Design a protein around this ligand. Structure first.
Ligand code: HEM
Length: 154
């Protein structure tokens, strides 16, 4: 797939707002993911034990990962589709070490779109959401093709 420059603009305009508070957005997104799809919490051997949203909000580790995650995602979006190099090391650790099925990357994509829609309604109207959705589908498709070359396709 190929996003037009206009679509990338809509994606990088609402991303510039996320970047004013990377850690808070990281928290929101992961919690939304763990409340909606609890099974995903099992993949984190470091968080696993958290029983409630309050415990999640108070975990420094969960907040640290959220920052790591969003920083990596932001560096991939700013490439505007030329993200081959960034995707290699990511695909290898998620396919071979963590073992994150494609389906879970769809779950966090949904959590990302839920959180932008709540926080940024004015910069996240229908067209901007369709463009973000296009940019995360692109990301999932290229990661899935790399999973396959690596022997996982999960
Ligand atoms: C937007 C998608 C994602 C991005 C950009 C992303 C990024 C990362 C990055 C940069 C790291 C650290 C370096 C590495 O291990 O490769 C990481 C670690 C990890 N990620 Fe992902 N990730 C994504 C989605 C997920 C999802 C959906 C899950 C699981 C339900 C997952 C589970 C983890 C785990 C288990 C680790 C290790 C955490 C720790 O113990 O240090 N990732 N991810």
């Amino acid at each position: 797939m190929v996003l037009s420059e206009g679509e990338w603009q809509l994606v990088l305009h609402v991303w510039a707002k996320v970047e004013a508070d990377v850690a808070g957005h990281g928290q929101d997104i992961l919690i939304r993911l763990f409340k909606s799809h609890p099974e995903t919490l099992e993949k984190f051997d470091r968080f696993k034990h958290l029983k409630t949203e309050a415990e999640m909000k108070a975990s420094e580790d969960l907040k640290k990962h959220g920052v790591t995650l969003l920083t990596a995602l932001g560096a991939i979006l700013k490439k505007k589709g030329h993200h081959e190099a960034e995707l290699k090391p990511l695909a290898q650790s998620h396919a071979t070490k963590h073992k994150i099925p494609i389906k879970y990357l769809e779950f966090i994509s949904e959590a990302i779109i839920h959180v932008l829609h709540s926080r940024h309604p004015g910069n996240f109207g229908a067209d901007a959401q369709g463009a973000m959705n296009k940019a995360l589908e692109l990301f999932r498709k290229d990661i899935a093709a790399k999973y396959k070359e690596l022997g996982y396709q999960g």
